[PDB]
Design an enzyme around this catalytic site. Structure first.
Site, PDB file in Angstrom:
ATOM      1  N   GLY A 299      43.128 -18.413-119.724  1.00 60.18           N
ATOM      2  CA  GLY A 299      42.798 -17.003-119.707  1.00 60.18           C
ATOM      3  C   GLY A 299      41.363 -16.732-119.288  1.00 60.18           C
ATOM      4  CB  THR A 300      39.681 -13.539-118.411  1.00 60.89           C
ATOM      5  OG1 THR A 300      39.888 -12.779-119.609  1.00 60.89           O
ATOM      6  CG2 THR A 300      40.761 -13.184-117.398  1.00 60.89           C
ATOM      7  CB  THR A 301      35.101 -16.055-119.590  1.00 57.83           C
ATOM      8  OG1 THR A 301      35.481 -17.069-118.652  1.00 57.83           O
ATOM      9  CG2 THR A 301      34.060 -16.625-120.543  1.00 57.83           C
TER      10      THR A 301
END
Lengths: 233, 141
Positions: B30-32
């Site tokens: 997933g994104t940060t």
């Protein structure tokens, strides 16, 4: 609630050309005992709504908690909750009326009378009333309890029909509200001299005045009243 | 033996639950999202991938709020994060209804932890595919 215990008396309210005014005393009555002074019976929701509650104080605190939780749950996943899609007086009143009528139909009523006042997003004045039976109605002048019998005549003398609202300044409406509160303190047995008042205007905003007192009391003539008929001294 | 990673809450011979580690793998994709605890509060930040310029900017909010003082961001399966946030909101509402005061951050953390741990206890439920950075200010800072 099947029988009210600690109660609060009349709540009055009216409209004016730029908004609404709503007042209520600060007393919690334990039957005939004026037990709790300093009970804030005006609950400001947001910066644009005020709820005035009369009746059982426990149910009023329940309504307070429900309104705070409604505000909180509206703030959820709503980046505009401080602008558009914010809680309007109409939304708060509809939630309250749904709750009151459902409790009435469940035979466990919320022994209160609620007046929701405020200014809509489009500058229109909202002012409506609900009670433990779920009856909802609106009028340029609203009042609960003794105020519905005495404060409403004095308030209708100022605003009798809808056309009178644009002709009523905030000063005239506030003076009428204070005069009605004085008359109520005159003739209500479960009343208080200290009260709170709120003016919701489409230009100034929420104006919350606390610790107001009824002044200009006419009692001098009482020195001349002697006996109950034939007594002269 | 083999096949220890086919059902949830199944201990492998090395003392591991591979479904939890697979959920962690799903999280890593997933994104940060980051959080920084400063002196007087906390800050949360997240990166939103603009797959196309058809996405309306400033919308599609990823950072969620619990009560009026808890902030929560998550990396992984965004719907599982929303589910966890709703569970935490219910916990905070019950805590405020019972104990009046807004829920403390450690209490909220333990509530969410018990929820996720219970979700890693049965083969009839799938582990959460999110890692959640949350926090806020309470009576203890």
């Amino acid at each position: 609630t099947q029988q009210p215990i600690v109660t609060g008396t009349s709540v009055i309210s009216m409209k004016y050309d730029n908004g609404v005014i709503i007042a209520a005393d600060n007393l919690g009555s334990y039957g005939s005992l004026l037990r709790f002074n300093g009970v804030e019976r005006l609950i400001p929701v947001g910066d644009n709504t005020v709820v005035g509650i009369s009746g059982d104080i426990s149910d009023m605190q329940h309504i307070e908690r429900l309104l705070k939780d409604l505000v909180t749950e509206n703030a959820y996943d709503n980046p505009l909750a401080d602008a558009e899609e914010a809680l309007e007086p109409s939304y708060i009143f509809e939630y309250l009326a749904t709750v009151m009528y459902q409790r009435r139909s469940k035979m466990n009523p919320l022994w209160n009378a609620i007046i929701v006042a405020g200014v809509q997003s489009n500058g229109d004045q909202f002012l409506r009333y609900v009670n433990l039976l779920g009856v909802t109605y609106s009028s340029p002048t609203l009042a609960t309890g003794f105020g519905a019998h005495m404060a409403n005549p004095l308030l209708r003398k100022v605003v009798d029909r809808e056309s009178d609202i644009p002709k009523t300044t905030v000063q005239v409406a506030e003076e009428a509200i204070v005069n009605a509160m004085r008359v109520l303190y005159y003739r209500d047995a479960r009343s208080s001299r200290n009260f709170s008042l709120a003016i919701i205007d489409k230009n100034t905003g929420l104006t919350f005045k606390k610790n107001l007192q009824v002044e200009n009391m006419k009692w001098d003539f009482a020195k001349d009243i002697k006996g109950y008929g034939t007594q002269k001294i | 033996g083999t096949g220890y990673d086919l059902s949830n809450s199944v201990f492998s011979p090395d003392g591991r639950n591979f479904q939890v580690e697979y959920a962690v793998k799903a999280v890593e994709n997933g994104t940060t999202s980051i959080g920084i605890k400063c002196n007087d509060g906390v800050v949360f930040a997240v990166e939103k991938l603009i797959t196309s310029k058809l996405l309306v900017p400033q919308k599609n909010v990823k950072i969620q709020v619990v009560d009026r003082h808890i902030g929560c961001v998550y990396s992984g399966l965004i719907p599982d994060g929303r589910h966890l946030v709703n569970r935490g909101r219910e916990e905070a509402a019950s805590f405020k209804k019972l104990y009046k005061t807004p829920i403390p951050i450690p209490a909220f953390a333990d509530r969410l932890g018990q929820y996720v741990q219970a979700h890693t206890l049965y083969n009839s439920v799938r582990p959460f595919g999110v890692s959640t950075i949350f926090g806020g200010v309470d009576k203890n800072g």
